[PDB]
Design an enzyme around this catalytic site. Structure first.
Site, PDB file in Angstrom:
ATOM      1  N   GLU A  97      -6.405 -10.438  -1.155  1.00 23.09           N
ATOM      2  CA  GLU A  97      -6.357 -10.498   0.318  1.00 23.09           C
ATOM      3  C   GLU A  97      -7.240 -11.639   0.802  1.00 23.09           C
ATOM      4  OE1 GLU A  97      -6.917  -6.876   2.513  1.00 23.09           O
ATOM      5  OE2 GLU A  97      -5.697  -5.669   1.117  1.00 23.09           O
ATOM      6  N   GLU A 103      -9.169  -0.948  -1.733  1.00 22.97           N
ATOM      7  CA  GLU A 103     -10.484  -0.847  -1.089  1.00 22.97           C
ATOM      8  C   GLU A 103     -11.132   0.545  -1.231  1.00 22.97           C
ATOM      9  OE1 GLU A 103     -10.201  -2.469   2.920  1.00 22.97           O
ATOM     10  OE2 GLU A 103      -9.768  -4.487   2.160  1.00 22.97           O
ATOM     11  N   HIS A 119       0.822  -1.225   0.000  1.00 20.77           N
ATOM     12  CA  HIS A 119       0.000   0.000   0.000  1.00 20.77           C
ATOM     13  C   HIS A 119       0.856   1.275   0.000  1.00 20.77           C
ATOM     14  CE1 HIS A 119      -3.216  -2.705   0.510  1.00 20.77           C
ATOM     15  NE2 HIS A 119      -3.676  -2.365   1.700  1.00 20.77           N
ATOM     16  N   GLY A 139      -8.285  -8.400  10.140  1.00 19.48           N
ATOM     17  CA  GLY A 139      -7.581  -7.809  11.290  1.00 19.48           C
ATOM     18  C   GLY A 139      -6.238  -8.457  11.582  1.00 19.48           C
ATOM     19  N   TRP A 140      -5.200  -7.981  10.902  1.00 23.28           N
ATOM     20  CA  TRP A 140      -3.879  -8.620  10.940  1.00 23.28           C
ATOM     21  C   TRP A 140      -3.194  -8.560  12.305  1.00 23.28           C
ATOM     22  CZ3 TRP A 140       0.934  -6.899  12.214  1.00 23.28           C
ATOM     23  CH2 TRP A 140       1.113  -5.512  12.338  1.00 23.28           C
ATOM     24  N   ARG A 174       8.063 -20.527  24.118  1.00 25.64           N
ATOM     25  CA  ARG A 174       7.317 -20.750  25.349  1.00 25.64           C
ATOM     26  C   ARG A 174       7.983 -21.743  26.301  1.00 25.64           C
ATOM     27  NH1 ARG A 174       2.209 -18.377  25.182  1.00 25.64           N
ATOM     28  NH2 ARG A 174       2.063 -17.085  23.294  1.00 25.64           N
TER      29      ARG A 174
HETATM   30  O1  LIG Z   1      -7.121  -7.768   7.375  1.00 23.37           O
HETATM   31  C1  LIG Z   1      -6.463  -6.699   7.513  1.00 23.37           C
HETATM   32  O2  LIG Z   1      -5.876  -6.388   8.573  1.00 23.37           O
HETATM   33  C2  LIG Z   1      -6.440  -5.766   6.307  1.00 23.37           C
HETATM   34  O3  LIG Z   1      -7.467  -5.715   5.308  1.00 23.37           O
HETATM   35  C3  LIG Z   1      -7.510  -4.561   4.516  1.00 23.37           C
HETATM   36  O4  LIG Z   1      -8.316  -3.636   5.241  1.00 23.37           O
HETATM   37  C4  LIG Z   1      -6.125  -3.974   4.203  1.00 23.37           C
HETATM   38  O5  LIG Z   1      -6.106  -3.620   2.811  1.00 23.37           O
HETATM   39  C5  LIG Z   1      -4.902  -4.874   4.474  1.00 23.37           C
HETATM   40  O6  LIG Z   1      -3.755  -4.012   4.603  1.00 23.37           O
HETATM   41  C6  LIG Z   1      -5.019  -5.801   5.701  1.00 23.37           C
HETATM   42  O7  LIG Z   1      -4.709  -7.155   5.303  1.00 23.37           O
END
Ligand SMILES: O=C(O)[C@@H]1O[C@@H](O)[C@H](O)[C@@H](O)[C@@H]1O
Ligand SMILES: *[C@@H]1O[C@H](CO)[C@@H](O[C@@H]2O[C@H](CO)[C@@H](O[C@@H]3O[C@H](CO[C@H]4O[C@H](CO)[C@@H](O)[C@H](O)[C@@H]4O)[C@@H](O)[C@H](O[C@H]4O[C@H](CO)[C@@H](O)[C@H](O)[C@@H]4O)[C@@H]3O)[C@H](O)[C@H]2NC(C)=O)[C@H](O)[C@H]1NC(C)=O
Ligand SMILES: *[C@@H]1O[C@H](CO)[C@@H](O[C@@H]2O[C@H](CO)[C@@H](O)[C@H](O)[C@H]2NC(C)=O)[C@H](O)[C@H]1NC(C)=O
Ligand SMILES: *[C@@H]1O[C@H](CO)[C@@H](O)[C@H](O)[C@H]1NC(C)=O
Ligand SMILES: [Cl-]
Length: 595
Positions: A257, A140, A56, A263-264, A446
Site C-alpha cells: 500500500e 494491518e 480485503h 485515506g482513499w 468541468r
Molecule cells: O489509505 C487508505 O484509505 C487505506 O489504508 C489501509 O487502512 C487499508 O488497508 C486500505 O484498504 C486503504 O488503502
C-alpha cells in the site's frame, strides 16, 4: 535553464523488473455490474500492466463442517476472466464461524479451510496459476480491524501457522507472506514484529519445529503527500529487518500500500488528473533508480502496490483514490453505470511498455546532476529481441511532477539527447504525452459544467481526453541518435518509444468480449497476450450488420466504449492490432451482440 536528459541505449546496465503491477481495494459489492466493469478496465491495461488485485475480506465471500465457496468462486472467476491474479489476503471469519485464534480447535479448522480453498482453486485454475498468487496474512493486524474475531499476539501466530501449514497441505509451491502493516518503532506494531520473530526463531503450532516459512515481508508506508518519503521510510524499516533478522536479509519486501496519501475516499483535486498519474510514476522511478539500480545497500524490494481499485462515489467521481471514475446514471430506464479511465490508469499503460533491462540515463540542469528526488526525472528501458515477432525496443519515460502540487502557469524546457541506438531495419520513434490540458477527462467534465448524470455525448467528450496525444511514427535519424526539445507542463508524462521493425507482423487479438452499458452503448475488451510485440499504433475495430471500420483516434488501451450516434450496436465485432509500420495482425474470433 533547460533540463538535460541523456539516455545511452548501448549501455544496458542491469535488469528492470516491473515491480509495480498491483492494485487493490477494500469492499464496504465485489460482483455487481460496477465491479465487473472496473476490473475490466484494470485488466485492460496493456501488456499485463496491472497483474494483481490485492483484495480485503475474501473469506467473507465464504459461508459455513463444510463451506459454500460460491461467492469466492464468482470474484475469482471475474479476476481470471480479466487476466488478473488476487493478492489473496487470508482475511475473514467465514461468515461468523471463526471468533478466537487461541481456541485450539479453531486453529485446526482454519488450517483445513485454507487447504480446502487452495486445493479447490488449484483444481479450478491449475497449480501453475495458483502458485503465482501472493497469499498474505490478514491486513494491518496492528490496526485492530478484526470485527468480532479475537486476534491476540499469540493468536496471530497460531493463525499464521495454520495459514502456512494449510497452504503447504495444498502444495509446498504456494507462497505466503505478511504481516502487511507499517512496522513502527517498538513498542509499536507488536504483531508485525512478533510475526517476524516467530518465523525466524519461534515454534510451529502444528509441527513443533523451530522457524516457520515466510516467503515475503509486506509493509505499508504512505507518503503524506511526499513521494520520496515513501522510499525513506521503506529504507529504515528494511535496514531494521536486515540487522534484527539475519535469515531475512534476502527475504523479498513488498510495500503493498504505497499511496501518496492515506485515506482513499478523501477528495483531493490532484487525484483527479495527471498530477496523480505523474506522481505514481515518480515514486516508481525513485524506487528503481534510488533503491534497485545497484545501490550500496541493495535491499530486496520486490513489489509496490498502489491501493486504488476502489470505486468512486457521489459527489466525488474523479477526486478519490481510484483508477476509474464512476458515474451512476440514475435517470435512464433502467439506471446504469459508466466508468471513465482516469489519467492514473492510463499512466499504468505507459509504465507497461518498459522492458526487461534498464539503460543508463542522467538528468541535469546547468551541469548539476539531478537524481529522481527532483521534479523532473526519467526511466529508460531496452528490449532484447526474443523471436521473429519482435525486434529491439527502447522505452524512455520522463516525468515532470511536484508530488501533489500542480503548476498550470509553468513550462519546463527539456532537451532529450538519446544516443547509441543499436542499428537495424525501419527504425521509428513514437511520442506519447499526457498533461492536464490535453488529457484530463476531469477537465472536460468541468468544461461541460460538471454534469451529475452525463448524456451519451458528454461521455464521448470526456472519453476523448483519456488517451495520450500521440505523434505518428517518424523514422529515426542516422547514427542511432535522437534529439528532442519538448516543452513539458507540470504535471506531465512523456514516453518516447523507439522501435525496430520485427520480421513478422503482429499476432492475433484474443478473448474479445462485449459488455452492455445501456441502450446504444457497450464496452469492447480484449487481451493482447498473443500480439507478441509492444510496437503498436492502435487496435482496429470492425462492426458488421450483415464488416466496416469503426473510425476512432488511435489507442493502445485494450478497451473501447462503442457509442455511435445512430444507437446501432447489435450485430458482430472483431479486432486486430496495427503496428508502427502500418502492418495488420490477424482479426480475433468474431464476437456477437444483440441489445
Ligand atoms: O489509505 C487508505 O484509505 C487505506 O489504508 C489501509 O487502512 C487499508 O488497508 C486500505 O484498504 C486503504 O488503502
Ligand atoms: C444515484 O443512485 C445511487 C444508488 O444506486 C446513489 O448511490 C449512493 O451514493 C451515496 C453517495 O452520495 C453513497 O453513500 C455514501 O457512502 C459512503 C461509503 O459508505 C460506506 O462506508 C461508510 C464508512 O466509511 C459506512 O458508514 C457505510 O455504511 C458504507 O459501508 C459514505 O462514506 C458516505 O457518507 C458521507 O456522505 C453522506 C452524504 O452522502 C453523509 O451523510 C455522511 O455523513 C458522510 O459524509 C455516503 O453514505 C451510497 O453508498 C451510494 N449507494 C449505492 C448503492 O451505490 C447515488 O448517490 C445516486 N446519485 C445521485 C446524484 O443522487
Ligand atoms: C531528497 O531531497 C530532499 C531535499 O529536497 C532531502 O531533504 C534534505 O535533507 C538534508 C540532509 O541531507 C537536510 O539537511 C535538509 O533539511 C532536507 N531539506 C528538505 C527541504 O527537506 C532528502 O534528504 C532527500 N532524500 C533522498 C532519499 O534523496
Ligand atoms: C451457496 O450460496 C449461494 C449464494 O448465497 C446460494 O444461491 C446457493 O444455493 C448455495 N449453495 C449451496 C450448495 O448451499
Ligand atoms: Cl493517494
Amino acid at each position: 535553464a533547460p533540463h538535460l536528459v541523456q539516455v545511452d541505449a548501448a549501455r544496458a546496465l542491469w535488469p528492470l523488473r516491473r515491480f509495480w503491477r498491483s492494485t487493490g481495494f477494500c469492499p464496504p459489492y465485489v460482483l455487481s455490474w460496477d465491479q465487473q466493469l472496473n476490473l475490466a478496465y484494470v485488466g485492460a491495461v496493456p501488456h499485463r500492466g496491472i497483474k494483481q488485485v490485492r483484495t480485503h475480506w475474501l473469506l467473507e465471500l465464504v459461508t459455513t463442517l463444510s463451506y459454500n465457496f460460491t461467492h469466492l468462486d464468482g470474484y475469482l472467476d471475474l479476476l481470471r476472466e480479466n487476466q488478473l491474479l488476487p493478492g489473496f489476503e487470508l482475511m475473514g471469519s467465514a461468515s461468523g464461524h471463526f471468533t478466537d485464534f487461541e481456541d485450539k480447535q479453531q486453529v485446526f479448522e482454519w488450517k483445513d479451510l485454507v487447504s480446502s480453498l487452495a486445493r479447490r482453486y488449484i483444481g479450478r485454475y491449475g497449480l501453475a496459476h495458483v502458485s503465482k498468487w501472493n497469499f498474505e496474512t490478514w491486513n494491518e493486524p496492528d490496526h485492530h480491524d478484526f470485527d468480532n474475531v479475537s486476534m491476540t499476539m499469540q493468536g496471530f501466530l497460531n493463525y499464521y501457522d495454520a495459514c502456512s501449514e494449510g497452504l503447504r497441505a495444498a502444495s509446498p509451491a504456494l507462497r505466503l507472506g505478511g504481516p502487511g502493516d507499517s512496522f513502527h518503532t517498538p513498542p509499536r506494531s507488536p504483531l508485525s514484529w512478533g510475526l517476524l520473530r516467530h518465523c525466524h526463531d519461534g515454534t510451529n503450532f502444528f509441527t513443533g519445529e523451530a522457524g516457520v516459512r515466510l516467503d515475503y515481508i509486506s509493509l505499508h508506508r504512505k507518503g503524506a503527500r511526499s513521494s520520496i518519503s515513501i522510499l525513506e521510510q521503506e529504507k529504515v524499516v528494511a535496514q531494521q529487518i536486515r540487522q534484527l533478522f539475519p535469515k531475512f536479509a534476502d527475504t523479498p519486501i513488498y510495500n503493498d500500500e504505497a499511496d501518496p496519501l492515506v485515506g482513499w475516499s478523501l477528495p483531493q483535486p490532484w487525484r483527479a488528473d495527471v498530477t496523480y498519474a505523474a506522481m505514481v510514476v515518480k515514486v516508481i522511478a525513485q524506487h528503481q533508480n534510488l533503491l534497485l539500480a545497484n545501490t550500496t545497500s541493495a535491499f530486496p524490494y520486490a513489489l509496490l502496490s498502489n491501493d486504488n481499485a476502489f470505486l468512486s462515489y457521489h459527489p466525488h467521481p474523479f477526486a478519490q483514490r481510484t483508477l476509474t471514475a464512476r458515474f451512476q446514471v440514475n435517470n435512464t430506464r433502467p439506471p446504469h453505470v459508466q466508468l471513465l479511465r482516469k489519467p492514473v490508469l492510463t499512466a499504468m499503460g505507459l509504465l507497461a511498455l518498459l522492458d526487461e533491462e534498464q539503460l543508463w540515463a542522467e538528468v541535469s540542469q546547468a551541469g548539476t546532476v539531478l537524481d529522481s528526488n527532483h521534479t523532473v526525472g526519467v526511466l529508460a528501458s531496452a528490449h532484447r529481441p526474443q523471436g521473429p515477432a519482435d525486434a529491439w525496443r527502447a522505452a524512455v519515460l520522463i516525468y515532470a511532477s511536484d508530488d501533489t502540487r500542480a503548476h498550470p502557469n509553468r513550462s519546463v524546457a527539456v532537451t532529450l539527447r538519446l544516443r547509441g541506438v543499436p542499428p537495424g531495419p525501419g527504425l521509428v520513434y513514437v511520442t506519447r504525452y499526457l498533461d492536464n490540458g490535453l488529457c484530463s477527462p476531469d477537465g472536460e467534465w468541468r468544461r461541460l459544467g460538471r454534469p451529475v448524470f452525463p448524456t451519451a455525448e458528454q461521455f464521448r467528450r470526456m472519453r476523448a481526453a483519456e488517451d495520450p496525444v500521440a505523434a505518428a511514427p517518424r523514422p529515426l535519424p542516422a547514427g542511432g541518435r535522437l534529439t528532442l526539445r519538448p516543452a513539458l507542463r507540470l504535471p506531465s508524462l512523456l514516453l518516447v518509444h523507439v522501435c525496430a521493425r520485427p520480421e513478422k507482423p503482429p499476432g492475433q487479438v484474443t478473448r474479445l468480449r462485449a459488455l452492455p452499458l445501456t441502450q446504444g452503448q457497450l464496452v469492447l475488451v480484449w487481451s493482447d497476450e498473443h500480439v507478441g510485440s509492444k510496437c503498436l499504433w492502435t487496435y482496429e475495430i470492425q462492426f458488421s450488420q450483415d464488416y466496416t471500420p469503426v473510425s476512432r483516434k488511435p489507442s493502445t488501451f485494450n478497451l473501447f466504449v462503442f457509442s455511435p450516434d445512430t444507437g446501432a450496436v447489435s450485430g458482430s465485432y472483431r479486432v486486430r492490432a496495427l503496428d508502427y509500420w502500418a502492418r495488420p495482425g490477424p482479426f480475433s474470433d468474431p464476437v456477437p451482440y444483440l441489445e
